[PDB]
Symmetry: D3
Subunit: 246 residues, 6 copies
């Protein structure tokens, strides 16, 4: 369901015996529970959003975070993705839940959205910033975000502390055909776009259990080794940055 | 003893009856305990500093954080202050503890220190950055800090989210004859000086109990109202920023 | 009447005997005369503005400078203030003078005005820039000012030559709940916004008599000591900067 | 022998019959001939270097370009590599040729070399810039290069015209554990370091034959497909940039 | 006919005997042939422009390059000049050729054109950039150029390698009342406006024959000595820069 | 004697009858008197320099301003010129006056002087900045100037208000083989080098009489028409900028 990753300790008690026929079903559910905790945590950083505010999810995938945002704040949520299938599923889902009047996904590039200047209360990129130019996406968020608005991103980034990106990070780039940025670029791009971090938290230790668990599932895609190893040697990190549009 | 402030819930049980003659003595001790928790927390962000590393405390006051740093990591600690009395006390103290061969304070401006380029493992400004130009002090820290080194600052800063600095912040500036900077300047100055935040945490809710407690003591200086009120309306905030020199 | 300050030597002969019952009335009139000389001097720097040009007064107060500008150049003058009372008074005044078809005040933030790009011949901030972000206000002036237009500001600013702002400057900030900027920021902000100083003149010696005089009047608000002392030790200065929009 | 790549049409006549036992030996020699043409072309862009000038090769590998430079200009050549084996081989080689008094390799990081400010006439990175931060390496070259000196680089870079780096580029990064930069970064980094391009030439069409040939040899390492495909779809390009230190 | 200059070796055989009465007519034709080769070369750098694309010629003169562009690509071509006579001639010419539905010139400043954002495929300044501010003209080209579009300029520029501009360059500035820029400014301005050079080629040796030839004609204006001498001592250079709008 | 120009009204009474044989001698003396008033005015902006301070004159010519500076402040004065003859004359002159122990000229480029960082109290470029790169010369002044030091420049600059430099300015560039900068560059370069204008005054009306007078003398060099005409149409201006090193 979710395209982003999870955080939090794994509930091994819930998993039970790996021998059971339903183990894989309890595992996928655990992965899901960790991803929900992640989105929930991202939401904790959006500030006091209200029923009349508009929120924007850049790279919304299936619209799950949008649904969570609305149920939590009762506000309007606009999502953007380049996948027609993802947008369609999200909207069908929204209609079936009877909230399609508040939540909507559309096919559009996150670098040039239809949202008017200063009309969005809060916005975010959950695992979707590693695909685009940071200065350009932050410049767009800074444009539609009202002064005083809140921007949040949960993303993996290489650690400039260990120098250039490790082979593991490059392996991830080649797997998703993305372009993971260094933590230095994230902070620089924000500063250049009137985005001032209020919170920066390294969630690497929190997301490691999610990946080790996934590496033992039938959900493996062959890239979990790059994630785990880079997270462990410190060259790659998972972080949440909450910033104010000033 | 400490020139910086505290964080953490107040132990009212420890305080006891305000009627006792020793209440004031238990209160000052509580304030002290909260300040120690603050320095300890700052230390948790210096990374894995070792016995052979050199640490720099810019605006070290009486040298208490330096003493804590050495006992915790066993490394060398150099402190800088403009107060001859403070430096002298710190060094006497260090000698009496038998660690003057590891810990030393000296009278010097934090904008032009004698430390050689790339020789310091970690450094920090604890409540002392609100006195100097941020670009210049971060440029100096960036100069002596080795590539990969860690810089930490605990400081009060006005929130650019509410616009220009409030009267409360100005009242604080006039009380200490300092120049509190906005959170935007802190992040901008770091980005311009090869300092990349690894952690940014708003400790405002954590330091509020310390000030409310101090406002009921005989330690009042008349400025605690500005602190408390600005911390409450959000115009002023207490934050910890840990950054890597890259 | 005027919200800005004055420049020029005090006419003690005019003041006469402090014992007279009308001394205070002659004093207030003297203060007024010095303020008018100030506005007049600001006007001398607007260039050859004509009857068909449009001028903008950011932070116009009661509209007095606007009235002076029109009578002098016969042009149109648009004023901006956040005070509904001030705007209303200014417009009533304009109507009574029969120039409301040329001079108008409105309630609006000076950072986001309704004036169209490149349509204003000259504009200014008279004692009103110490309240807002300099880059943002100069960016707005630069936007509506035609290429070749003239921008002028008369303002107090702390002197970066003596380092960080003195307690006196902070006391002023706390009194008006403003945010006095250093002279370095004024010049930097202009350079970053296509505003090129044609004239920069330190009027500190010229405005000192105005304040010393006010400090002996019943108009005292308790802040004249901060002004006088900072003007005297050089930490605070009163300057006029006339710049071209290029 | 050479660590960099080649340019120029393949001499199929020279290759002869693939059935011969010596085909592979003629092929490797052809690859070599194309690489020599590349180094020769890089040398054509160093300007009129003379016998008394000093040249620096950053990431010199086995020192082959250095040897070529000396024989061509008779000047002194200093090389830098992180490989002790490579440096040792290069120096042995130089001694055997009787030019070790002019050509020398040493183990050192190209970001912090021992060369004094403004003492080098020309310098270059041949296929070695994709490993380091561009601003930092150009800043170092700009430091030891005399005013008026010449800097040259032959490198692969992703094309910002097609957006973010393609999977092919990422595959190359993962293969060499490097960090290929976009052409935009190359030009930006130079401009920020007083390096002004005099020549920028896309050699992609010229280097394609070298790779297609290598892809049919026993020298294959499995990465030639990424090179060829990205060179063909335009996402990756091979370029020469010659710039003046001004 | 053409306002720009030429490149290529002179066909002395074509010129024939200087004694003939038609020598001057064959010379002017030769100059013309060299100018056409120049425009043709500029066109080779516009990329794969098609019939449905729109091209912009900033400082189009008589519209000759525009005519060439259309016949070559069949696309639409918009030209801008400040000369009403030049625009009128170009359009008459276009009508007579029956291509006025594709090619059009208009009187307009190249710093503020009517072309909509991101609608132009390629654009250029042929010998016309030495008249305007580089940052401003590149900013305008960058505005109407679509992402991925191509910008080309052929221009003379002083060489920052020899320091400040030579007397020869100044003599040229005074002759045309223009403002020749250094090669450093060209590259800097492009980098600041999202224009990334794909090709930079010094055509000085190629344009020298054109000027020496013109210096022997009845077309002399007295400035050919400044051109030739500065081209020869290296202080002035003729270059082509092709860049991508990214 | 002086290489810089003058300011102030011409004393026609002193000139007397143009018919006298000594008219030319009284004229040259008048020109001299106006130049001395200029240097004197520049000196009024150096601040409270004392006997123990060191002053630097970049592009000192014959050392006349240096001599004036010493006699006025009694301080040490170091001069820099590229003319061996000028330096020698200045020093001979200084010795003959018995002040060679305080005033000294030397042959050196003003972009790389031997003065140690932060050791100079005040410095200046009198009519010599139009020859060098502004960022580089201001960066050098900023380097040896102590924090709080004063920098002053009297120079001609083109007015960015009228767009690109006029033919007159170019004619001046060609006459002296210099590179007059726009007023925008002067202010920008200062801001980028920690130089904050304290005074900016347009002396164009004050220097016009000096040039009109010179245009009627036997001292004409043929360039006075460019000066006078550009000063009159506003495209060229003579200004004094006094700035603090902060």
């Amino acid at each position: 369901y979710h395209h982003h990753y999870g955080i939090g300790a794994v509930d091994h008690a819930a998993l039970g015996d790996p021998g059971d026929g339903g183990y894989e079903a309890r595992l996928i559910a655990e992965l899901h529970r960790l991803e929900s905790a992640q989105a929930e945590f991202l939401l904790d950083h959006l500030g006091p959003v209200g029923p009349g505010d508009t929120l924007v999810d850049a790279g919304c995938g299936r619209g799950g975070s949008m649904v969570m945002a609305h149920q939590r704040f009762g506000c309007k949520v606009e999502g953007v993705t380049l996948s027609a299938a993802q947008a369609e599923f999200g909207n069908r889902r929204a209609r079936e839940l009877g909230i399609d009047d508040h939540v909507r996904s559309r096919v559009c590039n996150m670098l040039d959205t239809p949202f008017e200047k200063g009309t969005v209360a809060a916005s975010w990129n959950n695992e979707s910033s590693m695909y685009v130019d940071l200065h350009d996406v932050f410049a767009e968020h800074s444009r539609f975000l009202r002064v005083g608005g809140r921007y949040v991103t949960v993303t993996g980034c290489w650690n400039p502390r260990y120098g250039q990106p490790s082979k593991w990070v490059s392996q991830i780039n080649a797997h998703f055909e993305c372009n993971i940025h260094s933590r230095r670029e994230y902070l620089r791009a924000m500063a250049d776009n009137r985005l001032v971090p209020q919170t920066v938290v390294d969630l690497t230790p929190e997301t490691l259990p999610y990946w080790e668990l996934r590496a033992t599932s039938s959900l493996v895609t062959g890239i979990e080794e790059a994630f785990i190893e880079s997270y462990r040697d410190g060259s790659f990190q998972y972080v949440l940055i909450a910033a104010d549009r000033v």
